[PDB]
Amino acid sequence: QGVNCTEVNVFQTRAGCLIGAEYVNNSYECDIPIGAGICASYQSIIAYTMSLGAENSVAYSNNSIAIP
Amino acid sequence: TNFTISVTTEILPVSMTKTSVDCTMYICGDSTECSNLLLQYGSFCTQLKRALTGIAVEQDKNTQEVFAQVKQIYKTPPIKYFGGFNFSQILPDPSKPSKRSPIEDLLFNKVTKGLTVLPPLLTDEMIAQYTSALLAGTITSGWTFGAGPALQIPFPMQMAYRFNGIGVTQNVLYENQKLIANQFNSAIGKIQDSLSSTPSALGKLQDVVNHNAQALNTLVKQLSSKFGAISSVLNDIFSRLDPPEAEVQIDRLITGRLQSLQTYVTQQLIRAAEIRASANLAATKMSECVLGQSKRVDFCGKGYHLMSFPQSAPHGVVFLHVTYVPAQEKNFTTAPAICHDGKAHFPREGVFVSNGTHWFVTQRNFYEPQIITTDNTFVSGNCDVVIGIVNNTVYDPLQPELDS
Amino acid sequence: KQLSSKFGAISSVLNDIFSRLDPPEAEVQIDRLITGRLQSLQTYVTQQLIRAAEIRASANLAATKMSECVLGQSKRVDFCGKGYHLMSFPQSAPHGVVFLHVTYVPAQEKNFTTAPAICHDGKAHFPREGVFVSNGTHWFVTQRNFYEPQIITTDNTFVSGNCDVVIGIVNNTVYDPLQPELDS
Ligand SMILES: *[C@@H]1O[C@H](CO)[C@@H](O[C@@H]2O[C@H](CO)[C@@H](O)[C@H](O)[C@H]2NC(C)=O)[C@H](O)[C@H]1NC(C)=O
Ligand SMILES: *[C@@H]1O[C@H](CO)[C@@H](O[C@@H]2O[C@H](CO)[C@@H](O)[C@H](O)[C@H]2NC(C)=O)[C@H](O)[C@H]1NC(C)=O
Ligand SMILES: *[C@@H]1O[C@H](CO)[C@@H](O[C@@H]2O[C@H](CO)[C@@H](O)[C@H](O)[C@H]2NC(C)=O)[C@H](O)[C@H]1NC(C)=O
Ligand SMILES: *[C@@H]1O[C@H](CO)[C@@H](O[C@@H]2O[C@H](CO)[C@@H](O)[C@H](O)[C@H]2NC(C)=O)[C@H](O)[C@H]1NC(C)=O
Ligand SMILES: *[C@@H]1O[C@H](CO)[C@@H](O[C@@H]2O[C@H](CO)[C@@H](O)[C@H](O)[C@H]2NC(C)=O)[C@H](O)[C@H]1NC(C)=O
Ligand SMILES: *[C@@H]1O[C@H](CO)[C@@H](O[C@@H]2O[C@H](CO)[C@@H](O)[C@H](O)[C@H]2NC(C)=O)[C@H](O)[C@H]1NC(C)=O
Ligand SMILES: *[C@@H]1O[C@H](CO)[C@@H](O)[C@H](O)[C@H]1NC(C)=O
Ligand SMILES: *[C@@H]1O[C@H](CO)[C@@H](O)[C@H](O)[C@H]1NC(C)=O
Ligand SMILES: *[C@@H]1O[C@H](CO)[C@@H](O)[C@H](O)[C@H]1NC(C)=O
Ligand SMILES: *[C@@H]1O[C@H](CO)[C@@H](O)[C@H](O)[C@H]1NC(C)=O
Numbered sequence A: 001q002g003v004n005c006t007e008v009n010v011f012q013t014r015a016g017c018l019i020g021a022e023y024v025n026n027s028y029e030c031d032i033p034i035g036a037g038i039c040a041s042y043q044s045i046i047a048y049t050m051s052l053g054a055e056n057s058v059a060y061s062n063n064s065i066a067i068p
Numbered sequence B: 001t002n003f004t005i006s007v008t009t010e011i012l013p014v015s016m017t018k019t020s021v022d023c024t025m026y027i028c029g030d031s032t033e034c035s036n037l038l039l040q041y042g043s044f045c046t047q048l049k050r051a052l053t054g055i056a057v058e059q060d061k062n063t064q065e066v067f068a069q070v071k072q073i074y075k076t077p078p079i080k081y082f083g084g085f086n087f088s089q090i091l092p093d094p095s096k097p098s099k100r101s102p103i104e105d106l107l108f109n110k111v112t113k114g115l116t117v118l119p120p121l122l123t124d125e126m127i128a129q130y131t132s133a134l135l136a137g138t139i140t141s142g143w144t145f146g147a148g149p150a151l152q153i154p155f156p157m158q159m160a161y162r163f164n165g166i167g168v169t170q171n172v173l174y175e176n177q178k179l180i181a182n183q184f185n186s187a188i189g190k191i192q193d194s195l196s197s198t199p200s201a202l203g204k205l206q207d208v209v210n211h212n213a214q215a216l217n218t219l220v221k222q223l224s225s226k227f228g229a230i231s232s233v234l235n236d237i238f239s240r241l242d243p244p245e246a247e248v249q250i251d252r253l254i255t256g257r258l259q260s261l262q263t264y265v266t267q268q269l270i271r272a273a274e275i276r277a278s279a280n281l282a283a284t285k286m287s288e289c290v291l292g293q294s295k296r297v298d299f300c301g302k303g304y305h306l307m308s309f310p311q312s313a314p315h316g317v318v319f320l321h322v323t324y325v326p327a328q329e330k331n332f333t334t335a336p337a338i339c340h341d342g343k344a345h346f347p348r349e350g351v352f353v354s355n356g357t358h359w360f361v362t363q364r365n366f367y368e369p370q371i372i373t374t375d376n377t378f379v380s381g382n383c384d385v386v387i388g389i390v391n392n393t394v395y396d397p398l399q400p401e402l403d404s
Numbered sequence C: 001k002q003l004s005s006k007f008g009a010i011s012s013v014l015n016d017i018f019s020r021l022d023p024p025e026a027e028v029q030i031d032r033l034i035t036g037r038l039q040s041l042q043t044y045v046t047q048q049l050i051r052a053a054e055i056r057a058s059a060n061l062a063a064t065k066m067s068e069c070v071l072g073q074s075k076r077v078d079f080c081g082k083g084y085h086l087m088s089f090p091q092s093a094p095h096g097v098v099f100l101h102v103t104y105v106p107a108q109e110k111n112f113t114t115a116p117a118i119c120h121d122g123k124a125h126f127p128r129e130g131v132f133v134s135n136g137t138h139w140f141v142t143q144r145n146f147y148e149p150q151i152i153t154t155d156n157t158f159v160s161g162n163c164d165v166v167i168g169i170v171n172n173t174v175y176d177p178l179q180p181e182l183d184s
């Protein structure tokens, strides 16, 4: 935490670099929080960005209504 | 007889900066004899580490709960048309690299040895995305996204629903939709000017940050205290004083540092309790008068509340409450009921008013004269048991149909 | 574990200090031991008081929720349950309380066309509690939480002004049973 590992699977984050876990471009549900917008989980262990949720863009119109 | 749209600013802190403190680094540092000596004190450092991990996880929990109220991210339509209403100040700016609306940008600009600061899990970007999704949900779905799947609804229909919820009929909306939109835009501009011109509007977050900085600075400065010893330096005492008593002197120094650290931890825990209480209050306000209409009076806005727009803030949240305020009152003469044909007529939802020679029924929040009829009135008993009743005839909406 | 801490002394047992060391400074050693244990007890008591404040706040919140949406119906949104709250079941738990909330969740939405009002005979008609819904050819009225279409009738609509001031209004007739009941 707060220590640069270049002067003491490498993925440098704002809090610090992670050794032993590979970064994945795809994002899934987070399990073990870490900080600075990144966290790691077990699936081997991988790290990914935050997953806010499934994208759902509603079609907004001036004359459209959705009655349940 | 008239109404105005006013925007009020409410600021509630959410969390502070996460801090981690190490006892063996803050007290003495790189002394092996100090490390050997502190093991005889028990597990006080373990208790401190547990307390700081607890405060960090509580800060993370409340900052996750106060913002991630929905699991679906909604996006605004590309067409920025809402029946004349303007939302460019609250909607995020695509030109900004951080995808932040200028209100949040102004709010961010107005806020300025073992110890370390943990970066928050919920940083600025996803907090801004959550606020944008909440704004899209409350501008395109109303309260439907907060009670299930998002349902499309026009903005004037949502305004009519909110006016019916607070107790205003839909007739005054379509006749003054342009006036309402202009008043809302003027109120948004005025509150933006007031926010930009008043540096004391963000006082709560400012004093929270100042208190945290002062506490950290005082904790740092407390290391250079004598604490009854000859000097605040450890190595000169170790290499100059006879160890037999030098052990007593260093024990007094480290126990004074431990007392200062325990006081700092207690103050941080009390501040964390206050912050958790404020965050719970903000979460209740978000549940009440952000994701839906709230019937509470003077809870999250002065006057008849309509809706609230959450805005991202550094270590806090700012709400833009929009309220309904009546104005331009006029004097009228009222009666408890109307005695017609030996029967008393009581209004179902209105009130009988008189301008001096004629009587009319009007809404409880707006002036709109209507002819007293049988559809909006009910008959219960005669007109002599009541006190203060007057004389008036009741027009029958059915009689002229069969009169001819 | 606090009883096992020497606190800088030579032993963790006060009897050993009393029977092992000279009393003139064994008094000071015992004073140091008891003041260290007193400080540990003070720290534990402060932690207990902080936990008591947190538990009191949680219990007050639980009592407020039980007075809100257990003894009656609550109109608050997402206060004690996701969705339109209906009622709840209070249950007993060890050192806690569990509520089995029952809520109303709308589902299976359908796309429809809506209008702000209906202009009939030069007058604007607004729904009293529903909304105007069109399925493609005819206009109906239903509630905002369910799909129960009905014929446009003056019983559930009120007239306030003309249709020349409103925006986005459509043309449709308004059914009234007075004409068929008086035709015969
Ligand atoms: C209710 O108040 C609003 C403003 O508070 C009035 O709107 C103004 O109307 C005058 C002339 O009618 C215009 O010159 C102003 O520019 C309007 N102001 C705004 C902000 O639009 C409105 O007329 C009032 N209604 C009644 C019935 O008196
Ligand atoms: C909504 O308000 C914004 C500003 O609050 C308006 O943007 C202004 O538009 C005028 C005319 O194009 C420009 O001269 C200003 O410089 C703009 N201001 C800013 C801050 O960019 C906007 O026109 C309003 N209406 C809509 C539909 O967005
Ligand atoms: C009270 O309001 C009523 C309703 O507007 C007024 O009655 C109208 O008055 C105007 C002129 O004052 C006449 O041209 C209309 O013919 C009246 N309407 C009806 C149905 O007769 C009444 O005058 C008002 N009273 C006062 C004292 O101002
Ligand atoms: C409203 O009208 C009723 C009857 O039309 C009034 O009742 C009468 O009042 C007069 C004097 O005010 C009495 O002499 C009658 O005996 C009353 N008749 C009955 C059947 O009660 C009533 O007083 C009127 N209200 C007001 C305020 O004057
Ligand atoms: C919209 O609803 C109306 C009434 O519910 C439908 O009209 C009926 O349609 C059925 C289906 O063929 C006919 O058997 C009835 O005779 C129709 N009734 C009337 C009064 O015309 C209409 O078809 C629906 N439109 C759509 C596009 O679904
Ligand atoms: C709704 O109906 C009204 C009348 O039933 C229409 O108003 C007429 O419009 C035509 C052409 O636009 C004019 O020639 C007439 O003079 C209008 N009559 C009146 C009394 O205004 C109106 O256009 C219709 N609207 C829609 C959208 O169909
Ligand atoms: C660590 O240092 C290297 C160069 O020494 C730098 O490129 C890198 O950005 C630093 N990492 C962090 C997280 O500051
Ligand atoms: C109504 O009348 C009272 C006294 O007659 C007066 O004090 C008040 O200002 C009046 N209200 C208005 C709106 O004129
Ligand atoms: C109002 O009060 C006055 C004096 O207290 C009284 O003369 C009058 O009858 C009262 N009117 C009503 C409608 O109660
Ligand atoms: C309604 O139509 C829009 C686009 O026209 C579509 O995105 C949406 O899924 C539709 N709703 C339903 C329930 O099918």
Ligand SMILES: *[C@@H]1O[C@H](CO)[C@@H](O)[C@H](O)[C@H]1NC(C)=O
Pocket: A062, A063, B081, C167, C168, C169
């Ligand atoms: C809705 O908007 C579209 C495009 O902005 C416009 O063509 C249409 O007339 C509008 N309808 C109503 C009822 O305002």
